[PDB]
């Protein structure tokens, strides 16, 4: 049997308690411990995560600019 | 000036694009 | 062979079936979206599906006559829209029930509960109730628009 | 609640959506995903 | 042809069953008409049967008190009719449910899904919802009889 | 046998006791005949009755204590609060059934299935909306109910 | 729309009955009939 | 003089007879 | 119907409870009880 | 002086005791 989430940890997916939920959130970014992680896939996933983070910073900055323009008194 | 009424609801369509691309990036990173 | 960048593949791995797997016909989003509509959402009995579909449809069927029907320029604009929507939902319920009466005379299948006589009658019942309720609740919102506005603006604090 | 800024009707419905519809939908989807297969 | 111009026969071919095949009891018209009422219509789920019966009954039960009740000569004529019909449908639902509770205590049959505890309870649920709905829509149409009159006469266009 | 407390269902090693509150004739008869446990009922009827009762009584709190209680829209506000809480309760019931009955279906009782729980949710939704609306309609028209109870229209 | 002839309340409900109810019912009956797959 | 309400309603009752006979002739011609 | 006596709101609801609710509920309980096919 | 609103309400509460005792007596006599 398996409860699917989290897909990256059968030791957690087979936890029949609420811990499975909590730890699933706590170990998602620790890519090194995902089941069957390789160094190359580790680096590539980190690369894409960096891209997403840069997009997030740009979106937050755009939010600052847009809200100042729209609802400000600049 | 003040931002145009039509102008505020024009940035949201442009925001639909990073929304789509973030959805794609999330679904691809889940793999 | 390092060539499968193509997004339009054979539908369900069968290239000889009259369909194509495209970003609209068979992509992850469209699949998880249409598949979780009340019509296809797994773990749902037919009457609940009908209830949800009717709620949505009867809710939005108020607008057309409300803003464009002949009573739009009377003192009974919302009442006229409501009456039109209720008649439309009644005719649609009759159509649904007739379809079910004719399509499921023979042997009752065992695939999905919706595709039987009992299941389709339950779906029609749910649709009728949900549609009448959705039309009446959208009517009630429109008629009491001032209290809705005061609520969403905190005017009553 | 009001707003002299343009499109002041947008927060009117957008605050409930960000506060009610969006959270309910995301929490329901994540709850179904947490408790999937079995 | 032959010698049987006779219109009455033994019921279902058994002359020793206490019944007769007559134009009222067993003509083609009555077989098709009774047999297609919500109570007997083939393949229907008991929920839809109850819903339809309740719609018809709740709709027509508003009239007697509306035109002849004690509030008929007051400002609350149609509300009086509605209150009466709603209370009557509530009592009727309690009667239907008590009936189901008492007659299906033992083993459940198999041929008639309406003649079971689950089926009769579904019938009662559908009858409650349909009766309340029909009564309230009859009341709503009567309370706005002027707009229905103007609709039917074209007094708004 | 003067003791009124005994083992539950004749098993002293099951985590329960048989007490006047947990396992008496009145509790057995009352709880066992509530719409949740009444024998033979279909899930949609259980749900309908439960929803009727709950939507009915959920009108009161916001009616008398909510923010619009001091406005010209008191009853409408209580109605809206009740309807929204019932909608969230219905979504909760549906989602519970969605996640608890994923695989094979037990044969014990119709309520404890995917189809049965969704039917109970439909019944609850319909009954709760109806009961809330009838409570609001009685409160909004309390004057005609008063004239009816006092014989003012005779 | 009115009428000064005798019993002018009759078109009031007969026109909807002839235009809406009669066609709906007869088309529904004929529909269930022509689709009936009872053998014969 | 003008026709009366009673005359209009009496003619509908009378027309109930050709209705039943037309139903009978129709259903027999179906045989 | 009015009442100058104290707590005259009591008959307002007590009359429907003694005349409608109590009779209906008790007759329902007795109907169920006298029709129960238990053992004997 | 007239009877009080509170004396009427206190009467029903006190009457709750013989109601419970009558329930117990009836159910015991059913045995
Ligand atoms: C600057 C960027 C950065 C990056 C990319 C990382 C990267 C990582 N850290 Mg690290 N760390 C950082 C900053 C960073 N850290 C900072 C600022 C601190 C001080 C608070 C720490 C302290 C730290 C500890 C103590 C641990 C990590 C852990 C981890 C790994 C798992 C993360 C995870 O899934 O936790 C999940 C994240 C959350 C549940 C967020 C909840 C908190 C919110 C924001 C409130 C991951 C590879 C964990 C690990 O895997 O150890 C080997 C671990 O134990 N980090
Ligand atoms: C010619 C076609 C036509 C016409 C004329 C109309 C006309 C109308 N439509 Mg409709 N519509 C149409 C087609 C059409 N529609 C189609 C094809 C769709 C897609 C199926 C829709 C779907 C749609 C929706 C979803 C809604 C309308 C609504 C309306 C009305 C909005 C104007 C108004 O009264 O302001 C006022 C508008 C509002 C007050 C918006 C309602 C705000 C509520 C409170 C939602 C708050 C959001 C949040 C999630 C709260 C949920 C609480 C929950 C958590 C418990 C209007 C009369 C609205 C309506 O019916 O008014 C009630 C509305 O909700 N339309
Ligand atoms: C991270 C950036 C950011 C932040 C923190 C905010 C903050 C806020 N906005 Mg704003 N907004 C933004 C960007 C942002 N905005 C952008 C770029 C636009 C133009 C497309 C708008 C247009 C917008 C409108 C029309 C309104 C707000 C409103 C609001 C307020 C309520 C949220 C809401 O209802 O609207 C929801 C926001 C949107 C629909 C726009 C999408 C936001 C960007 C494009 C995506 C942000 C993603 C980012 C990674 C965050 C993800 C979460 C994080 C954990 C990863 C809130 C204080 C309301 C307000 O005025 O309050 C009074 C409202 O009326 N925003
Ligand atoms: C405190 C527990 C409780 C509550 C909140 C309700 C509430 C409700 N019941 Mg239920 N009922 C209960 C216990 C309860 N019941 C039990 C233990 C039984 C088994 C004997 C029943 C059997 C019963 C039946 C057969 C029916 C209801 C129905 C109803 C709804 C109609 C309103 C009503 O009857 O007035 C409020 C009732 C009370 C304040 C007293 C509740 C306790 C008594 C013992 C209930 C007795 C039921 C009685 C025979 C039916 C009343 C007739 C009606 C004219 C009021 C309502 C929401 C009707 C319905 O529509 O269901 C879908 C209906 O058909 N009840
Ligand atoms: C935050 C807590 C809270 C609050 C503030 C309220 C507030 C309120 N409640 Mg509620 N209630 C609560 C919790 C609360 N309740 C809880 C926990 C329960 C138990 C689950 C109840 C159950 C309850 C019931 C059963 C009723 C109320 C009612 C009321 C309203 C009565 C005030 C009134 O209208 O006076 C004046 C008095 C009246 C209007 C009485 C109404 C007349 C009744 C309906 C006649 C019915 C009797 C008759 C025999 C019916 C059978 C007919 C049949 C034969 C067809 C009021 C707004 C009443 C109501 O909603 O009124 C419609 C009511 O019926 N409450
Ligand atoms: C075939 C002859 C005929 C024709 C073509 C019409 C035509 C019309 N009639 Mg009239 N009617 C007729 C005979 C006829 N009538 C007779 C004999 C009576 C006395 C019983 C009436 C009593 C009647 C009333 C009270 C009213 C009308 C009205 C109307 C108008 C609206 C339709 C309607 O509501 O009818 C309804 C018809 C009936 C209730 C009675 C049935 C009519 C006859 C008996 C049946 C005809 C069967 C036909 C021959 C079958 C062949 C069909 C063919 C295609 C196969 C319409 C222009 C309405 C009007 O005046 O509009 C302003 C109105 O309210 N009719
Ligand atoms: C056998 C004694 C008795 C009798 C015949 C009556 C008679 C009457 N009372 Mg009263 N009542 C009594 C005792 C009695 N009362 C006592 C002791 C109290 C104080 C608790 C009250 C408090 C009371 C109130 C508040 C009201 C009435 C009212 C009424 C009238 C309508 C009934 C009703 O709706 O109220 C129901 C009565 C009660 C809720 C109280 C319980 C009655 C006693 C305590 C129990 C009697 C049980 C009885 C002996 C069992 C016999 C069974 C037998 C057939 C086998 C009615 C004429 C109404 C009125 O004012 O009329 C306009 C009204 O609103 N009574
Ligand atoms: C432009 C962006 C496009 C996205 C759509 C936007 C609105 C449309 C919403 C429709 C959703 C479809 C619902 C059905 C989708 C659905 O039910 O799928 C199905 C699945 C459970 O159902 P089953 O597995 O039984 O169904 C499988 C098949 O039936 C598929 O059809 O649910 C999930 O997969 C979990 C949901 C993912 C959880 C996502 C995590 C989100 C949390 C993070 C959010 C970040 C927010 C940041 C910004 C603030
Ligand atoms: C002529 C004739 C006859 C008779 C008939 C009769 C006697 C009948 C009547 C009729 C009726 C009696 C009808 C009805 C109708 C009804 C309806 C159509 C209903 C309804 C309802 C509704 C629509 C509702 C809705 C709702 C709901 C459900 C919920 C929410 C609320 C509301 C309201 C929205 C016969 C064939 C035998 C023979 C020959 C001749
Ligand atoms: C999402 C989305 C979209 C869109 C859509 C649209 C455009 C629309 C829809 C909308 C709608 C369609 C909505 C709705 C609403 C509804 C409601 C809200 C309902 C209701 C109901 C109720 C609340 C109840 C009632 C009742 C009953 C039934 C009982 C008795 C009586 C009464 C009345 C109480 C798309 C696909 C594009 C894309 C993706 C996303
Ligand atoms: C005394 C006592 C008790 C208690 C009780 C309680 C705590 C309560 C209940 C109460 C309640 C909680 C009641 C209720 C009622 C409800 C109702 C009666 C409902 C309804 C509904 C209707 C009437 C209808 C509606 C509708 C629909 C659904 C459709 C359309 C719209 C309309 C609105 C028409 C017990 C037994 C435990 C113990 C002994 C003593
Ligand atoms: Ca007009
Ligand atoms: Ca306030
Ligand atoms: Ca009077």
Please give a structural write-up.
This is part of a larger assembly, with one copy of chain A (74 residues), three copies of chain B (31 residues), two copies of chain C (157 residues), one copy of chain D (38 residues), one copy of chain F (154 residues) and two copies of chain G (40 residues). By secondary structure, chain A is mainly alpha-helical. Chain A is built from three helices and no strands. Chain A has helices spanning 10-13, 19-26, 39-71. Chain A starts with 9 loop residues before the first helix and ends with a helix. Chain B is an all-alpha fold. Chain B is 84% helix and 0% strand. Chain B is rod-shaped and about 45 Å long. In chain B, 0% of the residues are buried. Chain D has one helix at residues 9-34. The radius of gyration of chain D is 16 Å and the shape is rod-shaped. Chain F is mainly α and 154 residues long. Chain F has one domain (1-154): Photosystem I PsaL, reaction centre subunit XI (Photosystem 1 Reaction Centre Subunit Xi, Chain: L, Up-down Bundle). A two-stranded antiparallel sheet of chain F has the order 1-2. In chain F, α2 runs parallel beside α5 and α4 runs antiparallel to α5 (114-140). Chain B binds chain D through residues 2-5, 7-9, and chain D through 5-7, 10.
The gist of it:
The PDB classes it as photosynthesis. The structure is cut from a larger assembly and holds one copy of chain A (74 residues), three copies of chain B (31 residues), two copies of chain C (157 residues), one copy of chain D (38 residues), one copy of chain F (154 residues) and two copies of chain G (40 residues). Chain B is an all-alpha fold and 31 residues long.
Number of domains of chain G: 1
**How many beta strands in the DSSP annotation of chain G?**
0
**Helix-strand category of chain G:** mainly alpha
Computed Rg of chain G: 17 Å
Number of domains of chain C: 1
Ligand list: chlorophyll A, 1,2-dipalmitoyl-phosphatidyl-glycerole, beta-carotene, calcium ion
CATH superfamily of chain C: Photosystem I PsaL, reaction centre subunit XI
**CATH top level of chain C?**
Mainly Alpha
CATH architecture of chain C: Up-down Bundle
Strand percentage of chain G: under 5%
- Overall geometric form of chain G: rod-shaped
CATH topology of chain C: Photosystem 1 Reaction Centre Subunit Xi, Chain: L
Q: Termini distance of chain C?
A: 67 Å
Based on CA inertia axes, which overall geometry of chain C fits?
A: extended
Task: Give the helix/strand class of chain C.
Answer: mainly alpha
Q: Write the H/E string of chain G, N to C.
A: H
- Report, as a whole number of angstroms, the end-to-end distance of chain G: 50 Å
Main-sheet strand order of chain C equals 1-2
The major pleated sheet of chain C works out as: 2 strands, antiparallel
């Amino acid at each position: 049997m398996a409860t699917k989430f989290p897909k990256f940890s059968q030791d957690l997916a087979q936890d029949p308690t609420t811990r499975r939920i909590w730890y699933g959130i706590a170990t998602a970014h620790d890519f090194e411990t995902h089941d069957g992680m390789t160094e190359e896939n580790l680096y590539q996933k980190i690369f894409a995560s960096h891209f997403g983070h840069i997009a997030i910073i740009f979106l937050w900055t755009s939010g600052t600019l847009f809200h100042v323009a729209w609802q400000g008194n600049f | 000036m003040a931002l145009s009424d039509t102008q505020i609801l024009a940035a949201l369509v442009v925001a639909l694009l990073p929304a789509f691309l973030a959805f794609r990036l999330s679904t691809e990173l889940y793999k | 062979m390092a060539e499968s960048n193509q997004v339009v593949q054979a539908y369900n791995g069968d290239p000889f079936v009259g369909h194509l797997s495209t970003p609209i016909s068979d992509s992850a989003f469209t699949r998880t979206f249409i598949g979780n509509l009340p019509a296809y959402r797994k773990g749902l009995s037919p009457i609940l599906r009908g209830l949800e579909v009717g709620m949505a449809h009867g809710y939005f069927l108020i607008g057309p006559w409300t803003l464009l029907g002949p009573l739009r320029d009377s003192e009974y604009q919302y009442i006229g829209g409501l009456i039109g929507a209720l008649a439309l939902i009644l005719v649609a319920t009759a159509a649904l029930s007739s379809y079910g009466l004719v399509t499921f005379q023979g042997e009752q299948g065992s695939g999905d509960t919706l595709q039987t006589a009992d299941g389709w009658s339950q779906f029609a019942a749910g649709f009728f109730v949900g549609g009448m309720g959705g039309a009446f609740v959208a009517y009630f919102l429109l008629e009491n628009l001032s209290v809705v506005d005061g609520i969403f603006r905190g005017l009553f604090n | 609640m009001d707003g002299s800024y343009a499109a002041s009707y947008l927060p009117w419905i957008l605050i409930p959506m960000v506060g009610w519809l969006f959270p309910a939908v995301t929490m329901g989807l994540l709850f179904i995903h947490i408790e999937s297969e079995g």
